[PDB]
Design a protein around this ligand. Structure first.
Ligand SMILES: Nc1ncnc2c1ncn2[C@@H]1O[C@H](COP(=O)(O)OP(=O)(O)O)[C@@H](O)[C@H]1O
Ligand SMILES: O=C(O)C1=C[C@@H](O)[C@H](O)[C@H](O)C1
Ligand SMILES: [Cl-]
Length: 165
């Protein structure tokens, strides 16, 4: 089982806090987004564009289930993995760290638009707040630890988690 599974909105720090937390624990980071682009050989954008979200979500879920069983390090989920109920089910019993971020900050953290199909285009503030409205209940539902990352720097978020594992 992972030492911890990080979830939260795009730009909440999953990948960054993931890396740093893995380094601190001396374990591997598995980043499901990364695991998908390797498993498929495609970008996340290319999948969303050629295959659609439903098809991404299915590939994501399979990867997520395997990671949850096979990885003993830090597992960072794609930002919308929690929208799959099979994902949410496979999370039950795990150490799930919900990185919380305000919309204004999240908007700004994602502002060099990392790809992110679902944040792409203009009206990014609006889209980000709508992602938050829909997913926040889902993150809270799967979370065993909620960490506010709003005015905490990545090292402090890492320490807050480490101290609570
Ligand atoms: N606690 C934090 N404080 C400041 N910037 C952060 C923090 N967490 C992440 N970031 C920055 O925000 C950007 C998005 O982080 P990332 O780890 O890619 O988020 P996610 O994996 O959740 O999309 C990165 O440049 C990272 O450097
Ligand atoms: O639905 C989402 O919020 C996301 C999906 C993909 O772009 C990536 O899996 C990412 O981490 C965000
Ligand atoms: Cl994300």
């Amino acid at each position: 089982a992972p030492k911890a599974v990080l979830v939260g909105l795009p730009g909440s720090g999953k990948s960054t806090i993931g890396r740093r937390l893995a380094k601190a624990l001396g374990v591997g980071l598995l980043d499901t987004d990364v695991a998908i682009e390797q498993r498929t050989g495609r970008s996340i954008a290319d999948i969303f564009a050629t295959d659609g979200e439903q098809e991404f979500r299915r590939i994501e879920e399979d990867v997520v289930r395997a990671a949850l069983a096979d990885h003993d390090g830090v597992l960072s989920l794609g930002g919308g993995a929690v929208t799959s109920p099979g994902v949410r089910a496979a999370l039950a019993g795990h150490t799930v760290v919900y990185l919380e971020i305000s919309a204004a900050e999240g908007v700004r953290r994602t502002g060099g638009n990392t790809v992110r199909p679902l944040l792409a285009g203009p009206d990014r503030a609006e889209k980000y707040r709508a992602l938050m409205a829909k997913r926040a209940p889902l993150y809270r539902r799967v979370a065993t630890m909620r960490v506010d990352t709003n005015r905490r720097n990545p090292g402090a978020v890492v320490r807050h988690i480490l101290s609570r594992l």
